[PDB]
Design a protein around this ligand. Structure first.
Ligand SMILES: O=P(O)(O)O[C@H]1[C@H](O)[C@@H](O)[C@H](O)[C@H](O)[C@@H]1O
Ligand SMILES: O=P(O)(O)O[C@H]1[C@H](O)[C@@H](O)[C@H](O)[C@H](O)[C@@H]1O
Ligand SMILES: O=P(O)(O)O[C@H]1[C@H](O)[C@@H](O)[C@H](O)[C@H](O)[C@@H]1O
Lengths: 109, 110, 107, 110
């Protein structure tokens, strides 16, 4: 229940070149993935990515100034992601993506 | 790897009821979870072994002072622990146990 | 990221004036805070923050009936040994407050 | 006897009217930076002030080389006027950074 942001995101597989969706919760410590949004019964994160090991590097530009709703989370250290690898996430709109990005930028700076 | 919203951290031993022995781990309490890590290296070892949602846990009994450094964490829902099942923790002292117990209790009242 | 246990309006009785005044309260693991209003973004300064570790809850109404008593164990906002009475809109709502408080303040 | 505290210690806050630092004992929780006159966590439990983190940010801090200061900025009118700034001083650079990084992660939406 104590969080900065939560909602669905699609995470890309580099090798498979496809996306899979999960329900994410950002807290001051972790980006957690859960299979669902039911916070009372779905209690065990699929994974918890420690923010202190991550940075957010790039994001999409708005189309007019999911195509424009991506951002990249970079691993600074070996954790869930191998050091100096990157995961790409896709939110429903540029606007929602920037909400994720702007929080993550502060948390990981 | 530098900041973390930790309310309490330290080593605890958790009794396994199948293995008949305690496993020690490095635990960190946040407002949302009691996380276990294999080690205390808060800069590098940052994938939890397990993360117990406080929203579905309670703390129920503990040792009387007079080891006397144990307490029970109970599951309200099916998670890491099956609904209605209980895990027993052992801290280094009664006093340390009560620091854990009181910090958990105030985060699991609902 | 607000960690709260419960929030809502309660009326707090004055023992001497024999009247109630209403406030918007927020129970956290550490305090029962009163605010003038429910607007969490603009009404930022607690009117008072009662430390739970200095309090117990002692009695409450039986169902017909929405009152409970918060007892000061030490001198804080309330004098040691003294009591404040709170009234919530229903027995059910009152028990929600009381049951949380009982756990938070139990020895 | 328990308290969800993420960080606590003495800080000096600069008053811009009094032209001096006032020292107080501060306790960070997930909701507030509270000031108390003393460190007596069992008896001195009415905050001097409680700064809502939802409407605070941390903005600058000292470069290593006092170098133990940081600025807390107000987003809204509260115990600081909106857009005004308070300067804190902690015993060392390292301790200042522990405060700064702990605040920063709790004030990313503010
Ligand atoms: O994020 P993943 O795990 O897909 O990491 C890849 C890096 O993304 C590439 O820069 C790099 O070129 C490598 O190919 C690497 O697999
Ligand atoms: O008195 P000590 O510190 O040896 O505590 C023991 C407990 O008494 C046992 O229940 C428990 O099963 C453990 O063996 C633990 O060692
Ligand atoms: O630690 P030192 O000796 O540098 O003391 C200074 C204070 O640190 C300043 O905040 C205050 O602004 C004064 O400039 C004062 O010089």
């Amino acid at each position: 229940f104590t969080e900065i942001k939560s909602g669905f995101l699609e995470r890309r597989s580099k090798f498979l070149k496809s996306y899979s969706k999960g329900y994410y919760v950002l807290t001051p410590n972790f980006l957690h993935e859960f299979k669902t949004a039911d916070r009372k019964k779905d209690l065990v994160p699929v994974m918890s990515l420690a923010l202190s090991e991550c940075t957010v590097t790039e994001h999409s530009r708005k189309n007019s100034t999911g195509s424009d709703a991506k951002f990249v989370l970079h691993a600074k250290q070996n954790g869930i992601i191998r050091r100096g690898h990157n995961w790409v996430f896709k939110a429903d709109s540029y606007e929602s993506m920037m909400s994720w990005f702007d929080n993550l930028k502060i948390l990981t700076s």
